[PDB]
Nucleic acid binder design. Structure first.
Ligand SMILES: [Mg+2]
Ligand SMILES: [Mg+2]
Lengths: 57, 119, 238, 49
RNA sequence: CGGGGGGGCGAGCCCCGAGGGGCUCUCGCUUCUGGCGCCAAGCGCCCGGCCGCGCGCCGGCCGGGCGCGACCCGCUCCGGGG
RNA sequence: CUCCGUUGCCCUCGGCCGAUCGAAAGGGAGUCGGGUUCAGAUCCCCGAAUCCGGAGUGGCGGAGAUGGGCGCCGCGAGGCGU
């Protein structure tokens, strides 16, 4: 609906009840989740490989 | 040592005082010229206005052209110890501002016509 | 354990592109408005250029040890304030028409303030010492004065601060000052300064008169030009 | 970009210094696909974009 | 930024006692994936109140402040000419 | 002078981007049936509406929100203490 109309409407008509709800489209949130592991985890895997490279050296 | 976080210089915000004038700059305050005798000039008595009084609980007024509705309302109220539901103004081709004033239902136009002398 | 397990560390790292950078002082990386920028690079030019002797002498100045004796000495001696003036007159008006008064008294010796006052009584050899401010704005007004002072054989000196020199005499600023006479008791301290000053000034002139005083580059340039003389030394000193 | 043979590319970095996101307009080098990280500056590696 | 100075994982050289030091480099630390990243944690050092021990810069509770973190100094806001 | 408001100063935070005008056809919330005049009618009236702003003191409902545990006392519905 024509955007100024949103000021009349209730909160619940404008989102869906979630993370990134009503701005982002599920399919991209659920990748943003399981990207946000594997970025995080593989800093840990580089963190320990770096620690083992300096333990070797 | 009050370090500069930002790389702009913005002017310092100074103190700036309030007018303490040594005289008033004009002697007296101007007498108010839009009054409860001046803002209303005359009620119309046209047939399409008698017809409007009797049928619609209104009164048709010519009004001073700088008048607002809350001025016309606190005029018509002040004078014909009346009270006003709503005001509704136009400018006649002639420059005369009309304003036809609906009077609250408790209260009649056809009586307050004869008080103000029209009819 | 008086150490709740939760309070941790979260130590950030501000390498390029890592965690976002914090707030350093930037006073050199900031936009210095047009008075400042300007006044900043007057002081630079005024070292960068080859400044003349006559304008140089207005850098080399007195030191704490000498300066503070001078400004002690003057404090016996500042010209009458206003109010202090009034009771010099008012007391003579009552003393005249009561208990005798020829009314010359003896005008106690005091300072002398401005330039075209000083220079006359330097050109008259009527001065023991002359104090000159260094920072004077049109330098014109005190360029000569040292030269003039040494020709008349008058001890001159260059104190810092036209303000603190212009605070003796009760004003904002002053460019010169002078003791013509002194109180008898106070003459040992005057003649103590005089001999100390003119070893250091009047009897220097062919050291002062021919000393140009700028021609000094920026430390950024100097650091670079010197870093090439470690290249040229260590080419054929090794 | 009208009146211009090259396509542009909007490339969002982020300001290394204020929490925000600067965006720019590089002239698209050929082989700029959409979704590329583009490395910039002295220490950057030698590849396209 | 230019100098300086910390760091230090590391390389060259110099020294060395085999602990280590000096000089040189390197860094100044973010590259497999449309991921997150500000308003500061941590340590330190202090002060107000309040409570407990009572000596109270002992301890608790409540509430603040500064230092490091985030090296120090400068003289041209950075770059290119002249 | 409660608490609130208002203002004074002190500390704290804020990039912008150009003093300003430019649409009766571009961008821009919300009004429509019926009635009515000689001439006017989303304009007047009747009825149905609707937007924006205000609502402080909060006008009134409803949400926040009404458990569980433990411990007693009560047949049991249950009551109380924590
Ligand atoms: Mg406009
Ligand atoms: Mg339009």
């Amino acid at each position: 609906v024509r955007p100024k109309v949103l000021m009349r409407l209730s909160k619940t008509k404008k989102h869906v009840s979630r993370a990134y709800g009503g701005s982002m489209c599920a399919k991209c949130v659920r990748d943003r989740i399981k990207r946000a592991f594997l970025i995080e985890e593989q800093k840990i895997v580089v963190k320990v490989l770096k620690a083992q490279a300096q333990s070797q050296k | 040592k009050k370090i500069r976080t930002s790389p702009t210089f913005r002017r310092p915000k100074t103190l700036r005082l309030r007018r303490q004038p040594k005289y008033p700059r004009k002697s007296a305050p101007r007498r108010n010229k839009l009054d409860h005798y001046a803002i209303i000039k005359f009620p119309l008595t046209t047939e399409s206005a008698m017809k409007k009084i009797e049928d619609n609980n209104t009164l048709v007024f010519i009004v001073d052209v700088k008048a607002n509705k809350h001025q016309i309302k606190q005029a018509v109220k002040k004078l014909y110890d009346i009270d006003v539901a709503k005001v509704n103004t136009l400018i006649r081709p002639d420059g005369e501002k009309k304003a036809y004033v609906r009077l609250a239902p408790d209260y009649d136009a056809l009586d307050v016509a004869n008080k103000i002398g029209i009819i | 354990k008086v150490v709740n397990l939760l309070f941790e560390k979260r130590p950030k790292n501000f390498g390029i592109g890592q965690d976002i950078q914090p707030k350093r002082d930037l006073t050199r990386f900031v936009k210095w408005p047009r008075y400042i920028r300007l006044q900043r690079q007057r002081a630079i030019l005024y070292k960068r250029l080859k400044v003349p002797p006559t304008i140089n002498q207005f850098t080399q100045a007195l030191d704490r040890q000498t300066a503070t004796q001078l400004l002690k000495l003057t404090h016996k001696y500042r010209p009458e304030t206003k109010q202090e003036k009034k009771q010099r007159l008012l007391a003579r008006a009552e003393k005249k028409a009561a208990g005798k008064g020829d009314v010359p008294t003896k005008r106690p010796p005091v300072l002398r303030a401005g330039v075209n006052t000083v220079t006359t009584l330097v050109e008259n050899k009527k001065a023991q010492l002359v104090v000159i401010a260094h920072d004077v704005d049109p330098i014109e007004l005190v360029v000569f004065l040292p030269a003039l002072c040494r020709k008349m054989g008058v001890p001159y000196c260059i104190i810092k601060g036209k303000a603190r020199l212009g605070r003796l005499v009760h004003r904002k600023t002053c460019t010169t000052v002078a003791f013509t006479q002194v109180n008898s008791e106070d003459k040992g301290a005057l003649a103590k300064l005089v001999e100390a000053i003119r070893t250091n000034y009047n009897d220097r002139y062919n050291e002062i008169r021919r000393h140009w005083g700028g021609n000094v580059l920026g430390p950024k340039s100097v650091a670079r030009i010197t870093k090439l003389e470690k290249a040229k030394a260590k080419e054929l000193a090794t | 970009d009208p009146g211009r043979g090259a396509p542009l590319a909007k490339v969002v970095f982020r300001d290394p210094y204020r929490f925000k996101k600067r965006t720019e307009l590089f002239i698209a080098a050929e082989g700029i696909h959409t979704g590329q990280f583009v490395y910039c500056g002295k220490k950057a590696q030698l590849n396209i974009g």
